[PDB]
Design a protein around this ligand. Sequence first.
Ligand SMILES: [Zn+2]
Lengths: 165, 619
Amino acid sequence: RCSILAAANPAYGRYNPRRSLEQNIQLPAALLSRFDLLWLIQDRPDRDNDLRLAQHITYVHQHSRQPPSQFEPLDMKLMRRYIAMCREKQPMVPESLADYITAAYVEMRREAWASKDATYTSARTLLAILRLSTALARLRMVDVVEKEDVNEAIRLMEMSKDSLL
Amino acid sequence: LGQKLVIWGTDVNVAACKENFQRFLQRFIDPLPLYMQRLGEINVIGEPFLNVNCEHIKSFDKNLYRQLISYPQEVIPTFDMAVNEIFFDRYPDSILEHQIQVRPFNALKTKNMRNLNPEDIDQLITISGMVIRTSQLIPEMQEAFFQCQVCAHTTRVEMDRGRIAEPSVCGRCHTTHSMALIHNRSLFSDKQMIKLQESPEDMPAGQTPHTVILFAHNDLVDKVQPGDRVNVTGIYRAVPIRVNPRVSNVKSVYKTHIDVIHYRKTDAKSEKRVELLKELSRKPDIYERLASALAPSIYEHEDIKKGILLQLFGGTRKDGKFRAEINILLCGDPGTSKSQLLQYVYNLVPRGQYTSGKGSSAVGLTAYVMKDPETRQLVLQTGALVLSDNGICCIDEFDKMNESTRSVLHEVMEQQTLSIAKAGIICQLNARTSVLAAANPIESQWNPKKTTIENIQLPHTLLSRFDLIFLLLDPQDEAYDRRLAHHLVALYYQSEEQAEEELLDMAVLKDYIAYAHSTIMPRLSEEASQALIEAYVDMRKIGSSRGMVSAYPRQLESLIRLAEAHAKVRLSNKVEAIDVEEAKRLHREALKQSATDPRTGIVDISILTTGMSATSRKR
DNA sequence: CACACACTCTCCAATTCTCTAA
DNA sequence: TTAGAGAATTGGAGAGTGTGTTTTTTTTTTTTT
Ligand SMILES: [Zn+2]
């Protein structure tokens, strides 16, 4: 009863946006449609970012420790306790937000129609949006889903598709 | 003398326990004189057992419940004596094949497989689990029959805890070692081993499941099949195992099993129905009502649901060799509602099957021969098409099957039989099955430019056997998509008062279909005959003019099937022009969907051949 | 190898036959 | 007429002898790929 975090590579060579996703990865839509977010983790040469990455890795090598990033992330145990505290909640979506969820879903659908040759979407898209918004509600530790949760779920899906395109 | 008895090392008086259980039977009344009703039910039905609830025993008398749980091996025979004494004090001349068995049970599990301990040995327990295997019927000897091989004098010996007191000498004569066990004059009772896994819902996180052995006897043997989920009440036994079969040394670590006292299945889910169905059949637009009742959980495709309804009802089987079965094919992208339709109607129909055309399927479409692993003997596993010999066979991923399976399905659809040429075995199995198929495009999503056959890439010969073919394409239309989205959010906000209503609708749909199949046998009227005849000629007209061909005689057979099925739906028992018109309408709608070339419209030879007329002139 | 089963032979004494007295 | 003491036969306890045991990989071949 587990969530799958998959990482694929293209069948041959580098990724190529000229081709379709199933042509790039050589894995059928029966697999690809089960997922909720499809992300393209791109990598281009970029001089200053490469310099910083190399400085980071060289510090890791010569000191056996992460460099000072001048940010204080939460410790791993605190993150674990937080996620347990935030997933203990079981929010519910209010019925007044059904119309807004409908509007967001249909406009995303119709943008796919109008601008990207009706690329594949279905009712599981709406179900995935609702699951993402409820996960956001759990994360915010509020037992009612809201406009901001729906907006951020829609935004997350749209930016994942933007990474693909 | 019974009053002197106490259970060994227990200080409980058997006679007092018997009296307490007798007054329990006589005076317990409130599950909302209870068990005398069960005794009367035994008296009229003729089944020698009584089910009793341990919670009722507990609420009536806590001490009696404690005695039952702690010392079942003595207390349960005491309860048998009590119930038989009451039953034959009443009903004085009723005859039973056996004395009644009391079968105490707890409504829910008292323990789980992981927490069973040596403290629980020879104690009554209840556990939940899933059945993994069930052995063949084992005969257990109950009384040994001996005969003297010198003088044919016979004697009978009773079984002492699993061993025989063999007579060393004969009584009539006096020869030594002359008494021989006559196996088939001895007396036997049924026994069976069952291997039971802890439930998936009961396993701890990420652990491999635990398993126990149950032993059932007499009438509880043949009540449980593999895959069932049961709450089994029984006595937790511990027995020794000998180190090797020819030596009586035993391992210090004992084997354990459960002597089954009671089974309760926990995954199972007439005139009062006929009276409803008779008037509901003559209610107006009952056809539409049933078709809309099919698969409420998906947004509506009217002609697909109508075709599946007529497939469920089927034509009339008569004799010559013409199939009453109706074959339906669904096409569309992955992510459409076709698989939901398949799984729904598989859950609905009797004698149904659901499997994948892919070679990785759980149960195959074709028949095969295999070594039964728990026995090593050969078994002929007839495939799903043969198992669904009077039902619907749902085939998901129908495009992905290999050419041998395509040949098997061609054979089954044409001839309604499956040939067996296995090593040694030669036979003609029966496969009068209605195939409901769900295909996919070979590409990722449906190509609008290419035809149905060109997209799914199945042979035209096999495509020509299907009576109806439909498509689940969704328009790029707000008028459809907005209301679909409203239906989806409403489906999220589904509640139990709608679930019960839809379950009732599905249940009366099941009863309707079963009652139709039970007796209703349509025949053709003269007007219906004329309508079908002129329908075939009319379908031939549009193509025969201009020199092409637009129909062929097997489509008349399909129309006959659909008309008979529609008469079956409306309970007419006489096929009429109403049924024939509906058959023509639905068949032409299926053709409008499936046989439409994007350029020249509906082309009939796209089913008779690969490609179409335009392609044949393009090359 | 060595520790349980499986089988035969021998001796010991307990029962029945024979002859006598109560 | 019963039964009890001495002699012979049969039952069986037990001493002695002999028998049986404690999934895996590479390669081929036909059919199907
Ligand atoms: Zn004899």
